């Protein structure tokens, strides 16, 4: 049941990996994976009904 993932290596001395085994039945007991996703800011930065083309007039 071991999960093997890669580290993003900062300062250096191949891919270096690390291992993780969950010891408990409840997912709430798990550590945080930090393997997170990013999304585009559009729902906050461009919430307009008509798609904005930046080279065009915003008002036409």
């Amino acid at each position: 049941g071991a999960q093997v993932s890669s580290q993003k290596v900062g300062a250096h001395e191949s891919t270096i990996n690390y291992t993780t085994i969950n010891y408990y039945r409840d997912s709430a007991s798990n550590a945080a994976s930090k393997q997170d996703f990013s999304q585009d800011p559009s729902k906050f930065t461009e919430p307009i009904k008509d798609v904005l083309i930046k080279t065009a007039p915003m008002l036409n």
Partner: peptide, 5 residues
Amino acid sequence: GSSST
């Protein structure tokens, strides 16, 4: 067994 990410 093992999972790889």
